[PDB]
Design a protein around this nucleic acid. Structure first.
Ligand code: ZN
Lengths: 433, 108, 122
DNA sequence: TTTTTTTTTTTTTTTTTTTTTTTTT
């Protein structure tokens, strides 16, 4: 009996005694050399955590036997190097089940720790930052119909279902269910009688202020004999289906985020915006070039009108909109900039706000700077390039006289926070290690 | 030829006795021409500083030096300023470790 | 057509499969590239300005073209250029060179370098 | 030996695709 931790490939005789804390579906695959089935599972003991995976014939022998939250004895498997891109655990190693792998269930679970939930009150979810794990409990209010969609990235039809989860905070929050768990959901008993549902490892999404989605390792339990679901049970039946609730918001993408960080290759490789519906994304990119010609235009000096202005017969600037002439045309940016990253290059358009911080200058101040010399004007622009920015963007289609083109529009452009950006990458590189 | 100059924290000193290294710290105390540094390693390093050094009135610092034969002291070759009068030392510790993991990019 | 964060040691290791063709770094075209280094020497010519530049991984020349006195010996710099090898000598042609924002970017860059490399490689 | 983490939602502003360092060491 080894602790999980002491497992290595340096040691062949061994037995762990761990409790499954999550189980994968049976995942198939089709490719050039192979075709088959894998499934995985996450182990726990006193000492630590380790993933374990069965391929093809071990799915048959073991998928039925290993169920979540039960404690098993595992023996005579292989210990491999973890593929950390395909796992949550920090372990250097994982296990693969071979054709000798012994598994029996221990009726001794008391040495073996139990999955400690760190629950978040629904009304506290807004304190947890998007794309992060979370354990959450609450009364299922109601649930939505099964929605099947094709995603634009996978291009593989998604079955989807949404649930409403409420607690003492009186706040309601949407939680998305995926795949089989979605479909076979109402097959779960006591599912209309306002069950309490317990979630481990749930993703916190910012669509609708806060929202929740599941992963392959997520876990919902229907009506658990944990004190908390009883408190809620006592709470809900006595004053819950009485009082009214708060929907969070700020159809559905519950658990979704409102603009994923994509590389430039991804935005194009996914055909973002090539459709009716605008797609939103986030790009970390460097400004490589700014288009000199037609950077600015003369605008309605009117309030809350920026309709272009034009020189009439009396050499004045008229807006067609507010129906008036001015001696002074308001300069505004119709910026056209070329941003690059390591995956490719791409054009963005930005308006007066964002372009001003990109050139650290109002358009008027730039106009005044061009009337003095072109040297001090192109200088300003050159000096705008070679700077990195986090780009909040939308991709939408344009009808230029029957012809279509994709235009990517910077909604907000902050400058890269290197400390934080750095840390993020630290996390990504650690994944290949 | 320029030898790559390793980016190190306080515990890498041993591996580079005699060599030129590069190191980043929070400045603790300045006693004459000696500087006391806080590493990303959270260890402390002692640096023998150039006469012309106004380091005192600065917070985080990057020293290009020679590890000296003792285990933990340092001749300053050059010195770079950062902070203000908010470098991320935890990030630095990580950049140290990851650069160590990738000689093909950061060394010979 | 890409902008690759690189270390100077990457630059020098990049291959140019003989003739005078485009350099490769990790089985990928190495066109426009970027990096952070300190300015060690500065020579000025009527045509161009050649800076001697080191990032702890190696040193390379970068010359930019006159048609930036802010930057100084022993100050970090962001470089945006292209690798040219004339007569075996390797150098970068910078249209863009800037003093580094805060030190944290130096750090950031090393990582951006590893991460980009990892993604071309796997 | 062998494979992944999905959805979703909006301005008022010109024209419609743009040229990045150009030449010596
Ligand atoms: Zn108007």
């Amino acid at each position: 009996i080894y602790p999980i931790e002491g497992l290595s490939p340096y040691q062949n005789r061994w037995t762990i005694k761990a409790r499954v804390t999550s189980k994968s579906d049976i995942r198939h695959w089709s490719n050039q050399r192979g075709e088959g089935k894998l499934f995985s599972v996450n182990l726990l003991d006193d000492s630590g955590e380790i993933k374990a995976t069965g391929f093809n014939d071990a799915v048959d022998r073991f998928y039925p036997l290993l169920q979540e939250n039960h404690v098993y004895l595992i023996s005579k498997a292989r210990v491999n190097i973890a593929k950390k891109q395909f796992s949550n655990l920090q372990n250097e190693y994982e296990i693969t089940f071979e054709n000798s792998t012994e598994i029996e269930e221990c009726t001794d679970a008391t040495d073996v720790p139990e999955v400690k939930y760190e629950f978040v009150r629904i009304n506290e979810l807004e304190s947890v930052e998007a794309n992060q794990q979370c354990d959450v409990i609450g009364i299922l209010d109601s649930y939505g119909e099964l929605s099947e969609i094709v995603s634009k990235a996978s291009q593989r039809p998604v079955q989807k279902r949404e649930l409403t989860l409420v607690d003492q905070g009186n706040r309601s929050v949407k939680l998305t269910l995926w795949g089989k768990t979605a479909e076979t959901f109402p097959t779960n008993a006591g599912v209309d009688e306002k069950p309490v549902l317990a979630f481990k490892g749930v993703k916190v999404g910012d669509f609708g202020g806060r929202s929740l989605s599941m992963f392959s390792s997520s876990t919902m339990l229907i009506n658990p004999d944990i004190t908390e679901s009883h408190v809620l049970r006592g709470w809900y039946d006595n004053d819950g289906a009485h009082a009214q609730f708060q929907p969070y918001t700020n159809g559905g993408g519950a658990g979704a985020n409102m603009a994923e960080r994509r590389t430039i290759v991804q935005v194009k490789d996914e055909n973002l915006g090539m459709s009716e519906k605008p797609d939103y994304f986030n790009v970390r990119a460097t400004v490589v070039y700014i288009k000199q010609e037609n950077l600015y235009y003369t605008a309605c000096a009117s309030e809350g009108c920026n309709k272009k202005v034009n020189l009439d017969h009396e050499n004045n600037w008229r807006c067609e909109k507010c129906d008036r002439s001015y001696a002074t045309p308001e300069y505004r940016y119709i910026l056209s900039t070329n941003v690059a990253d390591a995956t490719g290059q791409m054009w963005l358009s930005g308006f007066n706000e964002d372009a001003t911080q990109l050139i650290g200058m109002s358009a008027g101040e730039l106009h005044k700077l061009r009337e003095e010399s072109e040297s001090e004007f192109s200088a300003a622009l050159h000096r705008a390039a070679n700077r990195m920015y986090m780009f909040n963007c939308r991709a939408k289609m344009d009808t230029f006289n029957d012809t279509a083109r994709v235009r990517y529009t910077i909604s907000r452009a902050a400058p890269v926070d290197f400390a934080k950006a750095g840390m993020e990458l630290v996390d990504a590189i650690r994944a290949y290690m | 030829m320029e030898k790559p100059t390793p980016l190190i924290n306080s515990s890498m000193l041993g591996q580079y006795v005699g060599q030129t290294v590069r190191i980043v710290g929070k400045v603790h105390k300045v006693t004459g021409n000696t500087l006391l540094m806080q590493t990303s390693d959270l260890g402390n390093v002692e640096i023998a500083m150039t006469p012309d050094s106004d380091v005192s009135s600065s917070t985080f610092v990057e020293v290009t030096g020679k590890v000296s034969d003792a285990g933990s002291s340092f001749q300053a070759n050059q010195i770079r300023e950062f902070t203000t009068v908010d470098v991320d030392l935890t990030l630095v510790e990580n950049v140290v470790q990851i650069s160590a993991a990738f000689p093909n990019l950061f060394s010979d | 057509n890409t902008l690759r964060p690189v270390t100077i040691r990457q630059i020098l290791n990049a291959e140019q499969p003989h003739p005078d063709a485009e350099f490769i770094l990790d089985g990928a075209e190495l066109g426009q590239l970027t990096f952070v280094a300190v300015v060690r020497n500065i020579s000025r010519n009527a045509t161009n300005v050649a800076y001697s530049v080191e990032d702890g991984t190696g040193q390379i020349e970068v010359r930019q073209w006159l048609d930036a006195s802010e930057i100084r010996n022993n100050v970090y710099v962001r470089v945006l250029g292209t690798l040219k090898s004339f007569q075996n000598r390797r150098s970068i042609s910078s249209g863009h060179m800037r003093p580094v924002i805060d030190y944290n970017e130096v750090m950031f860059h090393r990582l951006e370098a590893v991460h980009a490399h990892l993604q071309v490689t796997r």
